[PDB]
Amino acid sequence: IVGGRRARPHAWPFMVSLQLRGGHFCGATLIAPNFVMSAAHCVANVNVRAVRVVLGAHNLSRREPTRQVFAVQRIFENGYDPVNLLNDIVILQLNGSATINANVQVAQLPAQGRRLGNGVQCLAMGWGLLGRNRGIASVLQELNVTVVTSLCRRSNVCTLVRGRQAGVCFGDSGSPLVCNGLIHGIASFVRGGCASGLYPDAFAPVAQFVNWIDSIIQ
Amino acid sequence: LMXX
Ligand SMILES: *[C@@H]1O[C@H](CO[C@@H]2O[C@@H](C)[C@@H](O)[C@@H](O)[C@@H]2O)[C@@H](O[C@@H]2O[C@H](CO)[C@@H](O[C@@H]3O[C@H](CO)[C@@H](O)[C@H](O)[C@@H]3O)[C@H](O)[C@H]2NC(C)=O)[C@H](O)[C@H]1NC(C)=O
Ligand SMILES: *[C@@H]1O[C@H](CO[C@@H]2O[C@@H](C)[C@@H](O)[C@@H](O)[C@@H]2O)[C@@H](O[C@@H]2O[C@H](CO)[C@@H](O)[C@H](O)[C@H]2NC(C)=O)[C@H](O)[C@H]1NC(C)=O
Structure with missing residues (x-):
């Protein structure tokens, strides 16, 4: 920004950081306890087994016990078109359910x-x-x-x-x-x-x- | 246009 x-x-508290090897590269939104929504182009050809989904974060440079980290179990796409930049949306199913609290909400x-x-x-x-x-x-x-x-x-x-x-x-x-x-x-x-x-x-x-x-x- |  x-x-x-x-x-x-x-x-x-719905704001999510998507990370590879500890480094933020894209955001996402928590839309159910076990699903986040992001831009499809963020995971284009990305090995999604490598992606960490970080909930409850504020300062990416500090240790934060408010954070909950998940892996991605499944991807749901909707016709992303990288030529025209259309349908730039993906849903990532997590490998469990977030714990909804003050810092992590849908x-x-x-x-x-x-x-x-x-x-x-x-x-x-x-x-x-x-x-x-x-x-x-x-x-x-x-x-x-x-x-x-x-x-x-x-x-x-x-x-x-x-x-x-x-x-x-x-x-x-x-x-x-x-x-x-x-x-x-x-x-x-x-x-x-x-x-x-x-x-x-x-x-x-x-x-x-x-x-x-x-x-x-x- | 640049994804981001
Ligand atoms: C900059 O952005 C803020 C926040 O934006 C608002 O909330 C976001 C989460 C999104 O939903 C945005 O779409 C939304 O615009 C704006 O703050 C908001 O300002 C308004 C107008 O001053 C506040 O409304 C008033 O509330 C008072 C009581 O506090 C009533 O008396 C009035 O009748 C009136 O409704 C509103 O509370 C406030 N919202 C938040 C979350 O802070 C801000 O105006 C905006 N500024 C500019 C210049 O664009
Ligand atoms: C769901 O996954 C998380 C996170 O898994 C990590 O991220 C993946 C991309 C991949 O790199 C994994 O190998 C990583 O472990 C799990 O959280 C881990 O849980 C293990 C076992 O309890 C623990 O050793 C680690 O501390 C946790 N890692 C982190 C980063 O928090 C979580 O257990 C999984 N939940 C399930 C299967 O329900």
């Missing part, structure tokens, strides 16, 4: 087909790059963004920060976009580098996939 702020510790999703209007105010979040001013975040970051349709398309939720250069960045893919208390997006792709101030950030449109998600987690 470029130009955001530190989240309050455990403000977003997210609330929108109704199937729910659209967001221009000007909806949302929060983006993640542990991605802060810039090449700084590096990967240690502490979870959040960012106020606004939903836009100029230079968007109906197959994405797109967002912009008005009046300054700020946005999601590498390592934030897979992280939730929270709009009106619901997970409406999964961070997918930027255009023209991070935080251009010109091209809206693109999120997978979670409301389009609710029936699919429900078919798996129920």
Whole structure:
């Protein structure tokens, strides 16, 4: 997240870090005790046996006994298209059930087909790059963004920060976009580098996939 | 366009 702020510790207890050999590379969202939702491109050709799913984290540079770590048992995809960057969504079934507590909770999703209007105010979040001013975040970051349709398309939720250069960045893919208390997006792709101030950030449109998600987690 |  470029130009955001530190989240309050455990403000977003559905937020997940996906890791390889102890290193964060993508976010995810806890959507049931034994399922997380992320971006499909995060696991494209990745050996998923190597992926650790880390719940309950805040500061990736500290020891945190709030964390719960899981492996991935099964992947459920929905037609990810890496040429057009469509359907950038995957569900990862965990090898057990999370212990739901103050620091680890299941997210609330929108109704199937729910659209967001221009000007909806949302929060983006993640542990991605802060810039090449700084590096990967240690502490979870959040960012106020606004939903836009100029230079968007109906197959994405797109967002912009008005009046300054700020946005999601590498390592934030897979992280939730929270709009009106619901997970409406999964961070997918930027255009023209991070935080251009010109091209809206693109999120997978979670409301389009609710029936699919429900078919798996129920 | 750059995934992220
Ligand atoms: C920056 O982002 C925050 C947080 O965004 C809000 O919550 C996220 C989890 C997502 O659901 C977002 O879609 C959502 O916008 C915004 O904070 C919110 O600000 C509003 C307006 O000030 C607060 O609403 C008011 O609440 C008071 C009582 O506290 C009532 O008296 C009013 O009638 C009014 O409803 C709201 O509580 C607050 N939400 C949170 C979680 O803090 C913030 O406005 C936004 N800023 C900008 C400039 O975009
Ligand atoms: C579910 O998996 C977790 C985590 O497994 C780790 O991550 C995988 C990607 C792979 O690298 C595994 O070999 C790792 O162990 C299990 O948590 C581990 O549990 C073992 C046995 O109890 C313990 O020695 C370790 O401390 C745990 N590792 C971590 C990182 O917490 C967990 O037990 C599994 N749950 C099941 C099978 O119900």
